[PDB]
Amino acid sequence: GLKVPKAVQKELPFKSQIHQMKPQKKKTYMAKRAVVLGGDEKKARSFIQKVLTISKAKDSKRKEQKASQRKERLKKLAKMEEEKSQRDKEKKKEYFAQN
Amino acid sequence: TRKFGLVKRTLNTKKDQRLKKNQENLTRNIPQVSSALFFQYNQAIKPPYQVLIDTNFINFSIQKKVDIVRGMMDCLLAKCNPLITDCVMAELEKLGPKYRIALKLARDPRIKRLSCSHKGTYADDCLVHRVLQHKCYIVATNDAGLKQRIRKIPGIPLMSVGGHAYVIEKLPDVF
Amino acid sequence: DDNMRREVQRDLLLIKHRAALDPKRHYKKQRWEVPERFAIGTIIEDKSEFYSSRMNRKERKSTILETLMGDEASNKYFKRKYNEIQEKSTSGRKAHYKKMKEMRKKR
Amino acid sequence: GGAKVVIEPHRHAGVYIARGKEDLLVTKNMAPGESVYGEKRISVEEPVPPTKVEYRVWNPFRSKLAAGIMGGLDELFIAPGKKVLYLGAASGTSVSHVSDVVGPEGVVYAVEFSHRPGRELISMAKKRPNIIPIIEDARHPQKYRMLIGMVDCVFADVAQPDQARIIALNSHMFLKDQGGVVISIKANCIDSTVDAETVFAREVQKLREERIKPLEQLTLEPYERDHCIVVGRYMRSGLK
Amino acid sequence: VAQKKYTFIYDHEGTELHRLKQHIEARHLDFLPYHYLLVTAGETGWLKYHDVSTG
Amino acid sequence: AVPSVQTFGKKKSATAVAHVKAGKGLIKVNGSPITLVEPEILRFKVYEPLLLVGLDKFSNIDIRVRVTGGGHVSQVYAIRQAIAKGLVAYHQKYVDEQSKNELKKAFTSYDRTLLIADSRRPEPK
Amino acid sequence: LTPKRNKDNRNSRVKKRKKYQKAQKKLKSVRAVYSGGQSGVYEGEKTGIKKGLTRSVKFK
Amino acid sequence: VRKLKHHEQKLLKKVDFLEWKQDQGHRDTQVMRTYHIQNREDYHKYNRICGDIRRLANKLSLLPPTDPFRRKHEQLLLDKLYAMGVLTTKSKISDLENKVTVSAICRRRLPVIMHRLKMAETIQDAVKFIEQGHVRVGPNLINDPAYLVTRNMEDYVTWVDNSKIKKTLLRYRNQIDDFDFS
Amino acid sequence: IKDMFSSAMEVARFEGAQIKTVSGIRGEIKRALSKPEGHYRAAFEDKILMSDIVILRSW
Amino acid sequence: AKLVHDVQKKQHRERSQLTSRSRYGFLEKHKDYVKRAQDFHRKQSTLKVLREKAKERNPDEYYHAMHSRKTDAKGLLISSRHGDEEDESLSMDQVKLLK
Amino acid sequence: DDQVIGKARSRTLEMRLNRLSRVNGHQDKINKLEKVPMHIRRGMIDKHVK
Ligand SMILES: [Zn+2]
C-alpha cells in the first residue's frame, strides 16, 4: 500500500489529513464481555459468509467480463464510425464538386 | 443577542416556487420485439396483404400511369387491400385544386380507409406510429425521409413507384 | 420492527444473493434492496395432491437458511467454490512474498 | 411445498410478490382457509394475538390477467377499491383473483352465460361476498342493466368474434368516463384466416371506433401463443 | 414603501420583491386600485405612474 | 479542569514541551526529576531558571518537560528555555502581571535567550 | 497451406442445422418464446419477477 | 398569483407580480446572495464603478488602434485592475468589457478572500468572524465585511492575536505556546 | 553487474555499451569496479530486480 | 489475416528463469515490469500531490471540526477506532447494567 | 485608419468584418438581426419605407 511518510502527513491540511487508526493492544471490557453463539449459529455464520463471497466474486467476474466485451465493441464501433465519416467527407466533396 | 451576518430578505429566483421557472417541483418501459418477427423476417404477414398509401405514392402512381390495386396485385402477385388514412386524405385535400385527379382517384371504393385518431395531419408520423405498433402493414411510399424511417424499423416491407411499375423491397417472399 | 428484522435478516440476505446459490439457476438482473413493508410466510401445499411438491413433516424447517444448510449438494458446491475463491484471492499476496524471501535466504 | 417466502408489495396496488428461489405472483385471500381451483397458498402470521392471514398464488398459465401482470403492464385499472365488470367469467378461476385484488370495499360483477359455470360462480360468491354473479348474455346488456350500476373497469375475457361490440355495449352502459377497459384478445378465436397482428390491429381500430383509447398492448407470449391484452381507457370525448 | 431614495415593493411576509430604479425620491405614494397604478411624487419635481401588474 | 499552560523551548533540533500547572512543586524532565538531567556539568544551565527567581515561585506549581531531538547541550538549552517561558506564561495567566514582568525582567537581564531563541540563519554576505 | 477449417463446414446441411439452432437459441433472448405451456406443477417464475419493468408497447 | 386558467393566461400574458423587466432578473439579489452582501445598495455602488470602467473602455476602444494614448491608457487601466484584483489576467483588453463585473469586485471582498484562503468554512462564517472582530489585515483590526482586499494586501490577512479561533487551531495541532498568548 | 566479464580490462574494452535486462529495461555500462574483477557498475532506466539478467547484444 | 499464413502467426513461447539462478524466483518479463512500474508511478504521483499540499497548507486554516478532532503527541491524527456514533467510555449506571 | 475617431471607427470596422465574413460564413449566421418586438419592428419598417 501507499506508505505516506510521517513528516509529510503531520504537515498536511485539515481536509487532507489521513485517518489512520492504531491497533488495539488492551483487552477491553466490551470485547471481553461480548458473547458469540456457537454450533448452529457459527455454521450459519460460516454459511452466510460463503454465500456472500461467492456472490461478490461472481459479480466481479461478470463485470470484468463485461469490461472485456465492451472495450472490443468500442474498438469495432470506432472503426465503423471512422469508415462512415470518411465516406461522408468524400460524398460531401462530390456533392459540392458537382454543384 | 441579535444574530450575526444579518441580511435583508429578498426573493430567491433559484428557490421560490411562486415564480414560473421554479414551478418544476420509477417504472421503465422496454417494449418487447414483436412475436411476429424472426430476426428481421416478419414471419407472420401473409396474403391478403394490406398496404398503407401516402400522397406522393399516389402522385407518382398517376404520373407513371399505374393503377393502385392492379399495380399492387402485379407487384406482389397477391391480393392487396390498400388503405388511405384520414391524414393522407387530409393531405391530398390540402394539396389544392391542382390535385383533383389524385383526390378523386384516392376516392375509390376498392381503396379501403382507416380512421386515424390524433390532432394534425402529419401522415408520416401517423404511418410510422401505426406501423411500428403492429407490424402487419406494407408501407407504400416515395418520400425519401419516410422511406428511410420505414426501412430502419424492422420487419416492415416497403413499396414504391419505380420505373413503370411498383417495386417492393423488405418482403422476402415475392416470387 | 428491527427486532424482527434481526430475526429474518439472514434469509433476506439469501434472497438478495439468490444468484449464487445454485450454479444452474441464473436469475434476471435486479438489485432487490430490502423492502420497507414485507411479511414472511409459509407455503401451504394443500391436502389434494401428494408426493410431488410435498415437503414432509420430518424435513420442514423454519427459515430458508436451514433448508439451504440441510442441502448437502449445496454444501459441496459452497465449500468447493469458496476454497477456489480463497486460493485465487491469496494467490500472490503475503505468504507468497515471504516464501519467496525465504527462498532467497535459504541458500 | 412447505418452504418459506417473503411477501412484498408489487407496483400494482393490491397484488404482491412472494420471493423465494422462484418468485410467485400472489394476492391476498378474501376467503381464508380454502383454495378455489387448487392453487397453492401462503399463510403469514401478521400481528389480541397475531392472526393467520393467507395469500393465493396467481397462476399465469391459467389466467390471462396474471400473464399480463407478470409480463408487465404499465397500468391495470383493477385496483383495491374499485368496481370491475368481468365479462366472460368462465369459472371462478380469475374472478377470484380479481375479487380479492379489488378487496372487501370494491365490487366485481361476474357476467357469465353458461349455467354450470354459473352454479360454481354462485357457490364461490358465497364465500367471496364482493362478487355479484350475473348469469346473462353479455351481448344484451339491457337484460341485466338493472343489476349493475357504474363500474370503474371492464375486463373482457370473452372469446367470441363479436367481442368489440360486446365490450362497446357494456362500456357504454356501465363504464364511467376515463375508466379502464382491459381486453384479452385471442386471435384464433376471433378469426384464423388472417395473422395475429392483423386481428390485433383490427380490434384496436374497432375499440377506437367505439371511442376507447388504447394505451398499451402486451402480447403475453411465454404463457399463451397468439394472445394479447389491450389496456385502454374509456375516453368518451376526444381521443384526440 | 418609499425609502431613503428608492421605492421598494415587499410581499406579504416582508421579503423584498422590487427596488424601483426610477422613482428617485418619493415622499408620497398612492395606489390606483381600479387601474393598478402606483403613483409616486416627491422631492424631485416629477410624478411617476408605474403599472404594478405588468411592471 | 485545572489551570495549565504549555510552552516550547528550542535549540538546533532539540525541542522541549513544558506543561506547567498548579500543584505541590515537582519539576520533572522526561519523567525523571530535574536533578537527573545529564551531562551533569550543564545541570546548572537547567537549574538557572529556578535559581534566578527563587524556588518560592516553584513551590506551588508542578512542571513537566518532554524533550525530543537534538543532542546533549541542545537538549539542556531547550529544557531551560521551556522552563523559563513556561514560568513566565503561568504567572501571566494565573498569577499577577507584576510578577509576570518581574520574571521577564529577571530572565531578560540574565539572558533573553532563555525566552527568545536565535532561530533563522545564516547571513549571505 | 490451408487454414484450419470446420467439420460443420464440410457439410452444407449440418451447418444450417447448427446455425438455426444457434438462431433459435438467440430468439429466446430477444423475445419471450412460447415454449409449450405449463409442464408440470406451477413451480414459480424460476428466474425472477421485476416489479419496475413494463415490457408492453405503448400506443403513439 | 392564483395560477390563471387558459383564457386568463391568454388574456393577460404580461402580468407578473414578482419578476419585472427593470429588475434585470434580480441579479443584485443573486450576487448578493452568492457573496453574502449585507446592505442592499452595495451591488449598485459596484455597478456604477463597473459602468465607469466599461464606459472608459468603450470610449478608449473608439480611438484609432495604433496610437500610444489608447495603448498606454488601456495597458495602464488593465494593470491597475489586475493589481487591485478585479481582473484575473492582464492579457487581453476585451477583459475591460467582458470580465469586469460586480461579481469580480465582490470576490475581492474580505469574507470571500477569507473563504478562499480556507480561513473560514463559508462566506457567512467569514462574515460572522470579521463582524465579531477576529480578523486583522496588517496590524489593524478590520471590522466590516465590505473591505476590498488587493493582491498584495491579501498576504497580511490573518487573525488577531489572542483570538479564540487562533488558539483553537494552534491547540488542535497542539502547537499552542502560551508564552505569546496563543 | 556480476559475471559477463572476467577482468576489468574486458570491462574497460566494453565501456559505454548499451545493455538491457530481459524486462527490456535499457541500460549502459559505466565503469569497472576495482576489487571484484569482472564486476561493473551500470545505470538503467529505473530500478531493476535481483531476478533479472542483463544482456549485451554483440555480433 | 488477409495475406498471412497460420503457420506464420504461430505462438512463440516464453522462457523461464535459469535453474542456477533459481532462488530469485520468476525471471520477470516486460508485462511484469510494466505492472511494477506503473504501480510505482501512481504511488509516486499521489505522494507528490500530498507533498505539494503540505507545502501549501496555509496555517490560518480554521474548520469547525478541529474542536472534536484531535492530535496525538507525534503530531499525527487520532482516529477513534470505536464508533463515532458511540462513546468509548460508558457511564457508571451503564456499566452497572452491563455487569 | 489610424485617424478615424469613434462611431465611424466602430461601424467601419464592423462593416469590414461583415464583408469579409460573408463569403465562408453561413447566411443564417452572418447577419443576425437585433431582436425587436413585432409591433415596433413593423412600425420601424413602415416609417422607413415611408
Ligand atoms: Zn392519421
Distance H66 CA to ligand 1 centre (A): 67
Closest CA to J82 of I1, D60, G27, A24: A24
Return the ∠ at Cα A11 (arms to A10 and A16), rounded to 5°.
Answer: 90
Using a CB–CB cut-off of 8 Å, the residues of H that contact F are 174-179, 181
G25: DSSP letter: H
Those residues whose C-beta lies under 8 Å from the C-beta of residue B54, and which sit 6 or more positions away, are: B88, B91, B123, B124, B127, B139, B140, B141, B142, B143, B146
The C-alpha of C55 sits at a distance from chain A's nearest C-alpha, in angstroms, of: 22
Those residues whose C-beta lies under 8 Å from the C-beta of residue G57, and which sit 6 or more positions away, are: B31, B32, B133, D216, D217, D218
The three grid cell numbers given for residue J13, joined into one nine-digit string: 513461447
Q: In which order are the strands placed within the sheet that holds B49-53?
A: B112-113, B80-84, B49-53, B138-140, B158-162, B165-168
* Cβ neighbours, 10 Å, residue B172: 11
C20 burial type by CB count under 10 A (0-12 exposed, 13-18 middle, 19+ buried)? buried
Query: Of F8, F91, F97, F115, which to mutate for an interface test with H (greatest number of H Cβ within 10 Å)?
Result: F8
Residues 3-42 of J with CB under 8 A from A: none
Say whether B27 and G53 touch across the interface (CB within 8 A): yes
Say whether H65 and K2 touch across the interface (CB within 8 A): yes
Instruction: Give me the long-range contacts of D112-117 (CB less than 8 A, separation at least 24).
Output: D112/D88, D113/D137, D113/D138, D114/D90, D117/D89, D117/D90, D117/D91
Separation of CA A63 from chain center: 10
| Distances D173 to C103, D168, D170, D177, I47 between C-alpha atoms, Å | 92, 9, 5, 11, 90
* D chain contacts of residue B114, beta-carbon cutoff 8 Å: 205
Say whether A9 and J57 touch across the interface (CB within 8 A): no
**What are residue D55's phi and psi, to 5 degrees?**
-140, 155
| Distances C40 to C7, C37, D42 between C-alpha atoms, Å | 11, 10, 9
Closest CA to D43 of C45, H68, J80: C45
Closest CA to D86 of D55, D114, D103, D107: D107
Bond into B48 cis (ω within 30): yes
Calculate the dihedral angle through the C-alpha atoms of A79, A80, A84, A87, rounding to the nearest 10 degrees: 70
d(CA K48, CA K50): 5
Q: Which residues pair with D217 in a beta bridge?
A: D230, G57
Q: Is B2 on the interface with H (CB under 8 A)?
A: no
The three grid cell numbers given for residue A72, joined into one nine-digit string: 472490443
- Residue D196, SS3? helix
d(CA B83, CA B80): 10
d(CA H109, CA H117): 12
Handedness of CA C48, C49, C51, C54 (dihedral sign): negative
d(CA D2, CA C47): 12
Q: Which residues pair with B67 in a beta bridge?
A: none
| Distances J79 to A22, D191, J47, J70 between C-alpha atoms, Å | 8, 77, 21, 8
Residues 66-105 of C with CB under 8 A from J: 100, 103-104
* J chain contacts of residue I52, beta-carbon cutoff 8 Å: 27-28
Closest CA to H34 of B166, C52, B13: B13
Return the ∠ at Cα H93 (arms to H88 and H97), rounded to 5°.
Answer: 80
* Cβ neighbours, 10 Å, residue D112: 25
d(CA H140, CA H156): 10
D43: DSSP letter: E
Q: Is B21 on the interface with D (CB under 8 A)?
A: no
Q: Ligand 1 (ion): which residues have CB within 5 A? A: B 85, 87, 116, 126
Distance B121 CA to ligand 1 centre (A): 6
* Cβ neighbours, 10 Å, residue D202: 18
Domain range for residue F106?
1-125
Q: Is C35 on the interface with D (CB under 8 A)?
A: yes
Say whether H22 and E17 touch across the interface (CB within 8 A): no
The three grid cell numbers given for residue D173, joined into one nine-digit string: 352502459
d(CA E36, CA E33): 5
Q: What is the 3-state secondary structure (H, E, C) of chain B?
A: CCCCCCCCCECCCCCCCCCHHHCCCCCCECCCCCCCCCCCCCCCCCCCEEEEECHHHHHHHHHHCCCHHHHHHHHHCCCEEEEECHHHHHHHHHCCCCCHHHHHHHCCCCCEECCCCCCCCCHHHHHHHHHHCCCCCEEECCCHHHHHHHHHCCCCCEEEEECCEEEECCCCCCC
d(CA K38, CA D18): 64
* D196-209 and D163-174 helices, crossing angle to 10°: 30
| Residue among H16, H19, H128 whose CB faces B4 most closely | H128
d(CA H106, CA G4): 75
d(CA A61, CA C25): 17
Q: In which order are the strands placed within the sheet that holds I40-44?
A: I40-44, I26-32, I18-21, I54-55
d(CA D182, CA D216): 10
Those residues whose C-beta lies under 8 Å from the C-beta of residue B175, and which sit 6 or more positions away, are: B77
Residue of H nearest to K6 (CA): H62
Closest CA to D58 of G45, F70, A31, F78: G45
**What are residue J28's phi and psi, to 5 degrees?**
-100, 145
Instruction: Give me the long-range contacts of F97-100 (CB less than 8 A, separation at least 24).
Output: F99/F57
The three grid cell numbers given for residue B162, joined into one nine-digit string: 419505380
d(CA C102, CA J24): 10
d(CA E36, CA E13): 21
d(CA B82, CA B91): 17
**What are residue H140's phi and psi, to 5 degrees?**
-95, 140
Say whether E16 and H40 touch across the interface (CB within 8 A): yes
Distance B53 CA to ligand 1 centre (A): 11
Closest CA to G57 of D74, D65, B31: B31
Q: B165-168 and D24-28 as β-strands: parallel, antiparallel, unpaired? A: unpaired
| Residue among I46, I51, I52 whose CB faces J25 most closely | I51
Bond into A5 cis (ω within 30): no
Q: E16-19 and E26-32 as β-strands: parallel, antiparallel, unpaired? A: unpaired
SS3 content of chain D, % helix, strand, coil (to 5): 30, 30, 40
| Residue among H16, H29, H39 whose CB faces B10 most closely | H29
Q: Which amino acid is at B31?
A: P
J14: DSSP letter: P
d(CA A36, CA B97): 93
Give the CB-side neighbour count of residue D129, counting CA atoms within 13 A: 2
Handedness of CA F50, F51, F52, F58 (dihedral sign): positive
Closest CA to K32 of K50, K14, K9: K14
**H-K contacts at Cβ under 8 angstroms:** 19
Calculate the dihedral angle through the C-alpha atoms of K13, K16, K18, K23, rounding to the nearest 10 degrees: -150
Those residues whose C-beta lies under 8 Å from the C-beta of residue B48, and which sit 6 or more positions away, are: B78, B79, B80, B81, D194
The C-alpha of G19 sits at a distance from chain D's nearest C-alpha, in angstroms, of: 23
Closest CA to H109 of H122, H96, H119, H123: H123
d(CA F49, CA F88): 10
K34: DSSP letter: P
Separation of CA H130 from chain center: 16
B146 burial type by CB count under 10 A (0-12 exposed, 13-18 middle, 19+ buried)? buried
H helix intervals, F1-125: 43-51, 72-93, 97-110
d(CA B145, CA B54): 13
- Residue D177, SS3? strand
d(CA E27, CA E29): 7
Q: Which amino acid is at E45?
A: G
Q: In which order are the strands placed within the sheet that holds D131-135?
A: D131-135, D107-112, D83-87, D151-156, D175-186, D227-233, D213-218, G57-58
Say whether D6 and C8 touch across the interface (CB within 8 A): yes
- Tell me the CATH number at F51: 3.30.230.10
**What are residue D26's phi and psi, to 5 degrees?**
-145, 140
Resolution of the PDB structure in angstroms: 4.1
* Cβ neighbours, 10 Å, residue H19: 17
* J chain contacts of residue C100, beta-carbon cutoff 8 Å: 25
d(CA H55, CA H61): 10
H helix intervals, chain H: 6-11, 27-34, 42-61, 68-84, 102-107, 110-116, 123-132, 164-172
The C-alpha of H120 sits at a distance from chain J's nearest C-alpha, in angstroms, of: 6
Q: Which residues pair with D16 in a beta bridge?
A: D9, D26
Q: Is E12 on the interface with H (CB under 8 A)?
A: no
* G chain contacts of residue J7, beta-carbon cutoff 8 Å: 1
Using a CB–CB cut-off of 8 Å, the residues of K that contact H are 1-7, 9-10
Provide the domain count of chain F.
Answer: 1
